[PDB]
Design a protein around this ligand. Structure first.
Ligand SMILES: [Mg+2]
Ligand SMILES: [Mg+2]
Ligand SMILES: [Mg+2]
Ligand SMILES: [Mn+2]
Ligand SMILES: [Mn+2]
Ligand SMILES: [Mn+2]
Ligand SMILES: [Zn+2]
Ligand SMILES: [Zn+2]
Lengths: 827, 827
RNA sequence: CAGAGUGGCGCAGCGGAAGCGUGCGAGGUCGAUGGAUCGAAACCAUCC
RNA sequence: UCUG
């Protein structure tokens, strides 16, 4: 058998001794020549179908040789093209000959998915009748034929005869429906056994037909087989067994076997029995019939394995993320932008952390990076763990180099040398390359070299020059495949990519939403939790600036909460104020007004809606913009909000697509919204909560949601500290974490407890919700975090005065978490 | 030579005598065998590339014979598939052998454009270096190669040498970049000259390479050619001339020629000059290099012609109604819906006219139609005229039969037997079939039979059974291709299809528009001329009833003009009234109000807008719907309309896509809207007319715009009557025509004047705009025709009392025509 | 435009099979691959 | 691969 070599960062199949050179291979005997050719072609097919690799063969002479015409032609047949260089490149050194094989297909969703076949095969074992000849279907023909099958005569006169005259002439020729065969003179039963697989499947795959055995096909003479040579019952039994032995694959019901009529008739010479002639009528088969199992190979674990018939048909007829595939170019430009003329280290925060914790690491890396002038060096605590592989103690970090005029290199940094370091690095590089091809959908020639570096005080293959990243196009394509690969795993870079995907989804929804600016002066925006209400408000204030050409301070933003007010003020896109400040001060200078979280306003301090109406109507350019954003699921009090009735809240816009939270958080939000609908708060007008989220909408961004109950306050705080420490060690910054509590009164108690639990984790700095721009964890109440978001949120003991409002507080908490949400309910 | 036979309704190529049968073809000399094969393959390639046809060949034997293995294999090579039955079917009758060829690709926009090449070829003449061998690209390979090009070494150490030593061993083998040749005799010059065309193009197309002439293949020793056989100057001249003789095609700029380096180096023997060795370095070429012209054939005019290199590359790399292509299925189910279980005649009005005009036509057709149980028979005055061919006097009618278990048949009915009737029918059927394939994109096996019928009391070819319409799928696909074909011509059916296309575009825009119903209670809809405003209003009322579940009489429609009132009222979708009636009467039972053409309202009778506000505000579902449709380009007076200010007209919806007029009418409306914008009326709001048509929007519907000036009134009347008579002869109805005049005072004059002409055309029935549902020509004023539309409009002498109102009239007139507009201005 | 590639060397076969002349019983799978044929070096195609 |  063929076995993949284990100590390489690629798929490497050793095919042993092979005779190379056209003269050398012509001097061989055909049997050994064909055996060597078949070995090489099985290896090539497996590598084509398994993501690419290297074929290693020892050559018997030192001097450079040509591969050979038969091997060339077999590779051409394998890829159905004369463009060998697109998939095969050879190098040779000393007594070694290498064939570097590119993947035939890459990714779960190729562009050519409906155009080209998924596999390469040495043979498909599919035959069809083409006029008077039987022709094997190549990979493309078999693909089309299986697609067709999957989508939902004077010969009969002779067939009806119960006997034939020796030397009789049949009145028709061979055709699409008729075949004439003579009997072999030597081995009659072996001959029929050989003949049935060639012709019966071909007729079955195309309209059926007649097979006459014992007929000269040049004369159409009936000859048959001498009775001394054949026994009709044995012949019939052999024929039937051969026909029933043929593999068949059904795309339908019922799955009845091949339908055929077999007649053995007497051949009478001068009216007396001379011999027997065989006639088979093959009726058209509903689906594909194979002469035998297809000759297609693939790499499974560490072995080169042939595909079964049904597995082959499944591949030929049939955690990935569609959002990554859709946005790969934008995501790559955002995170992995490749600069001109200098080498970039990312993530910068993790790089700075690593060089601070480890002495000489910066010098080691900078020394190793001297040869490379342009590219990106992507760091990580453990690329192995990033790819769902086992962590290795002693590995300081891993770095992936993607630089111009170089192949991808995975670096593993060790504090001190270890025996398993090289094996660990090779395993990680192999996994990364296979992911880049099979999950990331990279269609080029790719290799990842595994190099182990040490801090304290098998040989790599030389790949062809086509495996070095030539320039910007190659680097960007490889980095987009890397984006797709990373989005399928849990890691720091994966979470950053998920944040950017959520931002892109919000941008799409905002592009749709902003068309309402030209069409409404007053507008009531009813957004659902996680629908991006506040992002929409900020972007619409920006757009108002450019559309009405008014100076930024002419636009006013009103909200209920000081933390949200401060967050909006930090961007300088407008003037931001709280309901109380808005009602107290004077704003005749304001043209346009945007009100957010209007469901949380209150009437005691005045008629804010009337004041906003007056201010916007007294504008110079007609009645100014007055857009009121609100979300009735996120009501924080049972009092009157001061909004107009639901009948008078027109014109209306609905933000129903969740674009701000990962998939688990969005599902939790939907369930909580349904619970709210079942038990609505009585201050909300009856018909408000009948807004339903988009039925088939999903974010395609993976996140985290854990509910940890029955814990004490001390246990909760210890768990929070441990999780935060793990995130920070992996490379998350503190400013991506928020701890939200039941009420503002418990904030100080839980703050002291969190500091007690965190002083063990080397960080002692917390922040209030009013300082979102600081590099610290924010601890506050769910109420005071309205409109603000963090990647990681810890929800501690969500509870309120009215059990009816507890689902509301759960929604308000869950909607603040973008990717990771930890809830610690009461017990 | 090969010429298509003229007597047939298909492309028929006569290839003459051909030897058929494998045993008979083996007896031939190779020269004759190959000549016959080449002739048959030229015919097959031409038919594949020209929409299909029949190859006729006379065979030398009476009895049936198989085609022959070489012919089978050539056909398989031509279609790059063993599925011969998909494109070729054979029949033989006595001494004639027929090959029925299907089109390779159909239509200007095939669904597989990016996958398969548009042409079949005998050879592409494109060669690539494939390791150590040169291979020609098949059609698919060349398609991919030209698609790629269309986008905007130790060998060098031996090449750089000034001289070589006899017996020197080259240290490299033949490879992707190196080719060795060794000619040892006289004729060395001819050998290298004919070596150039096969190796230089391959290297040029495949990244360049080296050609060493004078190197032993097996040992790689430099031997060269004895001095006495080679003259270096002459050799260089031949090599350069051969290289520059190679055809090249450029997709780029600059179109620089092929770049190469040629060296004739001295081969020394112990320091003594022995001979010459020739070395060529071929650099990669920007584009495709051909060894010769491609071998591809096509039928143009009556000849089978070979494509030139440039035409072949164009066809391999590069009226057609795209709207028809998009909507073919809906258009077919609308106009050519095939019924189950009976034969349908269309158009029904034209059929009735024909059988009323001609005695015995009904029995003739019904007796001819007995064999057919299911299908459709499509009548016309002249299908030849419909297909832009010449009209033939004596043809009563043409009918296209599309029935199950039959081939398409075009019937030509003559009043009396004629000699040229069969030629006319055959030409029409040939044109129809060729259009169905090359313009309607029909990818099945299609033939149109041509039968001539006589009202007064070359043999046809028998097609394979696969050309008969098996059932619903084939008949519907053929009728959809017919829809596409008809939409590219002028005819009654083409106009009906264009009307349905306009309706489908309006329906798409209404689906986009109706989403505003949930979001708005008050809405001001600002439509441009031809934007479907009234259709939107009607459909929105229909949706209001369905969504609010209120009875139709609860919805009120208010307009300015009695004819539009009547037209809307007859729909029974609502209560419809005029402005004055609305002010006068009581409407407390009304929930919703829709107001159309609001810019034409007047303030004299009262505050209609205030009344509508009051009525709608007090509905059960809160404030009721109050949608006000209006178009300021279509104003009818200089007086105040009573609408609220433009700033107060919010929220707004703008209908900017023209969906109710054909392309010429839409372009005319766009041109005149600029004239309006140049000088708007003083009563019109300042900024309202700043709305613009959708930039890249086109209906894709053919229409007619004719402006006939410098004519007197009787000339106008005669032209109108003549055009109406021509339309009615072709089969149009009088209810498709409107004659619009400047004012109602001139209506009485023009009505008598128009009758004075129509009494010569045998129509004496006219009506005003209030009888739009009758079977008569409508004559009325342009303003009185507000909100209504007809397929054919004659606009006569537009006029007004003030130049300030003059600009609107031409738009207000042109917007009322759907497909045909005739304007008769002053002069 | 055609032809040739079978014992070290030169060569005949022309549908059932490995032989002749030279060189000394030995010496080749009839240039390679694929195809038709019940069946080949022999018929067909492509390639070197 | 070579030859006429
Ligand atoms: Mg013989
Ligand atoms: Mg052979
Ligand atoms: Mg066989
Ligand atoms: Mn046969
Ligand atoms: Mn070679
Ligand atoms: Mn060579
Ligand atoms: Zn089946
Ligand atoms: Zn070029």
């Amino acid at each position: 058998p063929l076995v993949v070599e284990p100590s390489y960062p690629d798929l490497v199949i050793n095919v042993g001794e092979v005779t190379l050179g056209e003269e050398n291979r012509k001097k061989l005997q055909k049997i050994q020549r064909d055996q060597e050719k078949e070995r090489v072609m099985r290896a090539a097919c497996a590598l084509l179908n398994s993501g690419g690799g290297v074929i290693r063969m020892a050559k018997k002479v030192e001097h450079p040789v040509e591969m050979g015409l038969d091997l060339e032609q077999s590779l051409r047949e394998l890829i159905q093209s004369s463009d060998l260089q697109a998939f095969f490149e050879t190098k040779q050194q000393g007594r070694c000959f290498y064939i570097f094989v590119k993947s035939w297909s890459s990714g779960p969703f190729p562009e050519d998915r409906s155009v080209k076949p998924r596999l390469c095969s040495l043979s498909s074992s599919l035959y069809r009748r083409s006029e008077t000849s039987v022709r094997s279907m190549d990979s493309r023909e078999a693909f089309c034929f299986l697609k067709t099958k999957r989508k939902p005569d004077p010969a009969d006169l002779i067939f009806q005869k119960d006997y034939l005259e020796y030397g009789e002439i049949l009145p028709f020729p061979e055709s699409q429906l008729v075949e004439f065969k003579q009997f072999s003179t030597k081995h009659f039963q072996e001959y029929v056994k050989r003949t049935i697989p060639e012709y019966v499947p071909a007729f079955a795959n195309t309209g059926g037909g007649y097979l006459f055995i014992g007929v000269d096909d040049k004369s159409r003479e009936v000859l048959g087989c001498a009775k001394e040579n054949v026994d009709p019952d044995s012949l019939r039994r052999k024929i039937e067994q051969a026909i029933y032995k043929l593999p068949c694959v059904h795309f339908c019901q019922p799955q009845r076997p091949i339908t055929f009529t077999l007649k053995i008739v007497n051949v009478l010479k001068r009216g007396e029995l001379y011999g027997y002639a065989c006639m088979i009528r093959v009726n058209p088969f509903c689906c594909a019939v194979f002469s035998e199992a297809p000759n297609s190979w693939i790499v499974e674990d560490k072995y080169v394995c042939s595909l079964t018939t049904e597995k082959w048909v499944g591949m030929m007829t049939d955690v990935y993320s569609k959002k990554g595939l859709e946005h790969k170019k934008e995501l790559q430009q955002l995170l992995f932008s490749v600069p001109p003329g200098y080498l970039r280290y990312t993530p910068e925060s993790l790089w700075r952390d690593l060089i601070s914790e480890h002495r000489g690491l910066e010098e080691l890396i900078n020394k190793q990076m001297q040869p490379f002038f342009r590219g990106i060096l992507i760091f990580s605590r453990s690329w192995a763990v990033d790819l769902n592989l086992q962590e290795k103690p002693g590995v300081i970090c891993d770095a992936l180099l993607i630089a111009q005029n170089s192949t991808p290199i995975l670096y593993t940094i060790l504090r001190e040398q270890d025996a398993e370091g090289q094996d660990y690095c090779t395993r990680t590089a192999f996994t990364l390359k296979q992911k880049l091809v099979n999950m990331g959908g990279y269609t080029g020639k790719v290799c990842v070299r595994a190099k182990v570096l040490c801090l304290s005080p098998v040989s790599p293959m030389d790949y062809p020059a086509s495996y070095s990243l030539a320039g910007t196009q190659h680097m960007e394509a490889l980095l987009q495949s890397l984006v797709i690969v990373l989005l399928g795993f849990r890691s720091l870079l994966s979470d950053q990519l998920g944040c950017e995907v959520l931002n892109l989804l919000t941008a799409q929804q905002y592009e749709i939403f902003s068309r309402s600016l030209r069409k409404n002066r007053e507008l009531f925006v009813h957004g659902l939790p996680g629908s991006g209400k506040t992002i929409m408000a900020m972007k619409i204030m920006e757009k108002i600036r450019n559309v009405f050409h008014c100076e930024a301070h002419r636009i006013l933003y009103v909200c209920e909460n000081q933390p949200l007010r401060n967050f909006i003020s930090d961007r300088n896109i407008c003037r931001a104020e709280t309901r109380k400040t808005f009602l107290r001060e004077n704003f005749e200078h304001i043209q346009h007004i945007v009100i957010d979280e209007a469901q949380n306003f209150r009437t005691e301090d005045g008629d804010w809606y009337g004041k906003a109406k007056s201010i916007t109507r007294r504008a110079k350019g007609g009645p100014g913009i007055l857009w009121i954003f609100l979300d009735y699921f996120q009501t924080s009090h049972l009092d009157c909000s001061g909004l107009p009735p639901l009948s008078d809240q027109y014109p209306r816009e609905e933000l129903t697509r969740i674009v701000r939270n990962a998939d688990p958080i969005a599902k939790y939000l939907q369930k909580e919204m349904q619970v709210i609908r079942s038990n609505p708060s009585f201050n909300i007008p009856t018909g408000c909560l009948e807004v339903f989220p988009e039925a088939e909408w999903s974010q395609g961004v993976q996140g985290t949601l854990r509910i940890k109950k029955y814990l004490t306050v001390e246990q909760i705080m210890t768990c929070v500290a441990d999780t935060c420490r793990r995130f920070f060690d992996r490379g998350y910054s503190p400013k991506d974490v928020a701890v939200l509590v039941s009420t503002a009164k418990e904030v100080e108690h839980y703050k002291y407890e969190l500091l007690k639990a965190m002083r063990k984790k080397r960080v002692v700095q917390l922040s209030d919700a009013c300082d979102m721009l600081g590099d610290h964890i924010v601890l506050d109440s769910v109420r005071r975090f309205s409109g603000l978001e963090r990647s990681i949120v810890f929800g501690i003991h969500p509870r309120t005065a009215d059990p009816a409002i507890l689902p509301n507080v759960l929604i308000c908490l869950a909607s603040r978490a973008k990717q990771h949400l930890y809830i610690f309910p009461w017990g």
